[PDB]
C-alpha cells in the first residue's frame, strides 16, 4: 500500500529522527529536574505532565513503526524490541524512568553502531572473562577460609570476599585499607594478595583491550557499509587475489 | 611589495621563532616568580615591567604578521587567531596571564602538529564520548533519587552526583570512602556502583585509546608533509595500484 | 586394541567433557558452600561426601586416560600432568581444595588456549621483567638505607621496603599515606619517589602490553590450527611468495 | 698483536660474561645484606671485604677492556663509558653503591637492547612531553595564585603546587584528600581540577604508549641484527620493490 510506504519514508527521514531525539532529550531534562527535592507541587505536576506528553509521542512513534513495517517485521530488529520494551514497560503500573534516555543510542545511527560493535566483540573474549571469573571464585573461597574469622566485615562470607577482592583488583586502598591491617594478624598475607593483584589487573587489562580492539574494527566496517554499502576487504584477501592474478599471467606466458 | 616579502622572510625565519620562544619563556618565568608572596615591592614592580616588555614585543610581532600576510589573510589560520586573541585580551583592562605560555604550542611547529593531531582526532570519537555522557547523566539521576536523602553531601543534587560519579570512575576512594558507607544504609548499592565502574572505566579507556591511535596517525602524516611535502600512501592504495598494473600486464600478454 | 580406541573416542567426546565440566562446577559449588560458618553438622557431612564423590569421578577419569593413551604417553602433555598432580595431591593426607576448579581451564579447550597463549608469551618479556626486578631491588636497598631508621614500619628492612615500593608502584596512598609523611622528616624524598613511580609504572605497563599483544597473536594461531588444522601465514611470507612468482614470470618473459 | 686478540676473544666469551654477571649479583647480595641494622661487627667487616673483592674484579675487567680495545676505542661505546664511570666513581673517597647493580643491564645483551630501545624512542615523544611540561607549569602557577593563601601546605608555592598536581594526575586521594577540602572554601574548584585530570591523564597515557610502541619496534630490529646481522624490511619497501619488478615485466612485455 501507498500509505505504508508514505509512513516508512517519514519514519526513515532525518526530520522525524531529529524530532524524536529532541523529545528524548526533553524527557531526560524533565526527569533530571524531578530529582530536585525543593520543587513546588505546581512545578512537579507541570514536569510530570511533560513526562506523560513525551511518553505518548513515543507510543504514537512505535505504533507508526509497527504499521509501516509489520509486526513480523518491526520485531525482526533487536533495537526495535528494546525501544518497544522501554516504552511498553512504562504503561504497566519501573521507578527508573531515566533508562529511557538509552533510546538516544537506538535512535542515533552512529551511537547505535558503537554499541553494536561493543556487543559483537563480547563473544570473542568469553574465555578471558571466564578465566577472570574462575580466578575470582577460587580467590573468594580462599580469602573466606583464610581471613573470614579474623576479618569478618571484609571476608566474613563469599559475598563479602567477592566485594573486597573487586576493591583489591581496582587497587582502591588495597594496602593501607585492607592488606596492611590483615598482615598485623596474618604476616604472610602478601603471598595471597600481591599474586592476586598481579593476575587480576593483567586479566582485566587483557579483557578490556580485547573488546576495545575488536569493537573498533567491527564499528569501522559497519560505518563503511552504512555509507558505501560495503566494507574494505582484508589485506590477506587483496594479497590472495593478486596471487590468483599472477597464476593467470604465468599460464598466459606459456601459451 | 618587496617590504612585505622582506618582513615575511624574517617572520618565517628560525631566528625570529627562537627570539619569540625565548620571550614566551621569559614571560612564563616572571609570572611564576610573581606567585611568590614574600617578594618586595621593588622586585614585584621590576617583574611587572618585564611582563609589560614581553607583552609589547608580542604586539609588534602580531602587527608585523598582520602587515606581511594581510588581515584576510593572517586571520585565515586558527593558530594566528588564537595568538591574536591571547595578546589582544591582555590589552583589555583576564587575571590568568600564564595562559599565554600556551603560545609555545602555536610558535613551535612540532608542538603545534601534536595538538592539531589531537584536535582532528576528536570528531571521530564523538559517539563514544556521547555514550559516556549518556551513562553519566542516567547514573547521576539514579544516584540522586536512590541516595540523595541519606547521603546529601555526595548525592544531594544532580551536580553533587555528577562529581561523586566522576570520583567513582577514577576509582578514587570509591569503596572505603563512598560505597562501603552507602552499603551500611543500602545493602544492595554494589548492584548500582560495580556495573557503573565496569561501564565507565571501559568507555573512558576506549575514548582515550581512540584519540591516542587516531592523533598519532594524523601527526605522523602532518610531520611527513612538513618535511617532504607529501605523506606515505595507505597500504590499501599501494595494493590497489599493483592490481591496476597487473591488469595492463594481463592485457599486454594477449596482444 | 579395540578397547583402548573405544575408551579414547569416549574420553575425546563432547559429552564426556561436559560431564567432567559439570562435576568440576559441582565440586566448586560444594567447596564454596563449605566456607559457611553457620552450617549444621549434617549439611557439612553431606557436602563433604559430595566432595569425595567428585574426587573419585576424577580418579576414574585420569585412570581411564592413563589406560587409553599409555603412561609414556598421557604424561607427554603438560595439561595431563597438571590434572594428575591436582587429583593425586588430594589423595595424600593441601587444605586449598578449591585450586581443583583450575581444572576448568585444562578441561575446556578454548580456556586452555588462552592460558597457553599467556604462558608462551612470557619468555619474550623476560628482559623487561628482569629490568623491573633490578629497579625494585636497587630501590629497596636505597629506601631501607635512606628511610628505615625514621620510618621502620614501611622501610625497616628489605622485605618491608619491597612491599611499600610495590604499594607506591600501584599508586595506592603513595602521597597522602607514604611520601607526604616521609617528606616531613626528609624534605627531598620526592627526588627518590617521583622518578621511582615514573620508571616502574612505565615498565609494568610495557611488561603487561608485551604479554597482552604476544598472547593474543599466539592464541589466535592456536585457535586457527584447532579448527582448520593450520594458521594464516605472515604478511611478510605472502609478500615473499609473490616476489618469487615474479622471478618465474620475469624468467619466462625472456624465454 | 696476538695478545690483544687473545684477551678480546676472552672478554667477548660467554664464560667471562657469566663470571662478571655472578660477581655483580654477589655485590648486589652483599649490599642488600648490609642494610641489616642488627648485623655484628665481624659480619659487617666480612661483607665489606666481599664488596672490595667485587670492586677490584671490576677494575681488572675494565683495565682488560681498555687494553684489548684501546682507549679511543673502548670509550667509543656509551655502555663502556657508563661501566667505567660506575666503577671509577667508587675509587673516589657516592654512598649509593647499589647503583652498580645497573651493570647487569650493560653486561647482559638482551637487557642492554631493551634499555637502548627505550632511550632511542625518547626523542620521538619530546613534543608530547613538552606539552605535558607546559600544562603542568601553567596549572602550577594557577593553583598557587588561586589556592595558595587558603591551602598553603598543598599550594603555598610553585614547588608545593607541582607536587600536589603530580599527586592529582596519578589520581591519588585527589577528591577525598585534596579537591573536596578545597571546594569547602572554593566551590567552583572542580572547574580547574576535573579538566586538569582529563588533560594530564590523557597526555601521560599518550606519552607512555608512544614510548612503549616505538621502543618495542626498535628492540625487535636490534634483536634481529644481533642474530642474523640484518633486520626485516618495512612492508612499504617490499611493496615498492614489487612495483619496481612490475615495471621491468611491463617493459619486457612490449620488447
Ligand atoms: C568480578 C565481579 C565481582 C562482583 C562482586 C560483587 C559481590 C557482591 C557483594 C554482596 O553480595 N554483598 C556485599 C558485601 O559487602 C552482600 C549483600 O548481598 C548483602 O545484602
Ligand atoms: C564526565 C564529566 C563529569 C563532570 C562532573 C562535574 C560536576 C560539577 C560539580 C558541581 O557542580 N558542584 C560540586 C558538587 O560537589 C556544585 C557547584 O556547582 C556548587 O557551586
Ligand atoms: C615486584 C614484586 C615485589 C614483591 C614484594 C613482596 C615483599 C614481601 C613482603 C614481606 O616479606 N614482608 C611484609 C613487610 O610488610 C615481611 C614478612 O616476610 C614477615 O613475615
Ligand atoms: C611532571 C613532574 C612534576 C614534578 C614535581 C616535583 C615537585 C618538587 C616538590 C618540591 O620541590 N617540594 C615538595 C613540596 O611538597 C619542596 C622542596 O623543594 C623543599 O625542600
Ligand atoms: Na589507579
Ligand atoms: Na587510588
Ligand atoms: Na586511593
Residue numbers in the entry:
A (entry chain A), B (entry chain A), C (entry chain A), D (entry chain A): -1 to 91, 100 to 261
Sentences from the paper on this structure:
Prokaryotic sodium channels, in contrast, are true tetrameric structures, composed of four identical subunits, each one equivalent to a single eukaryotic region. Both eukaryotic and prokaryotic Navs consist of voltage sensor (VS) and pore domains, which are responsible for regulation and ion-translocation functions, respectively, and C-terminal domains (CTDs), which appear in both cases to have regulatory functions, albeit of quite different natures and structures. Prokaryotic orthologues exhibit approximately 25–30% sequence identity with human Navs and several have been shown to have sodium ion translocation activity and one (NavMs from Magnetococcus marinus) has been shown to be blocked by human sodium channel blockers with similar affinities and kinetics as the human Nav1.1 isoform3, thus indicating the structure/function similarities of eukaryotic and prokaryotic Nav orthologues.
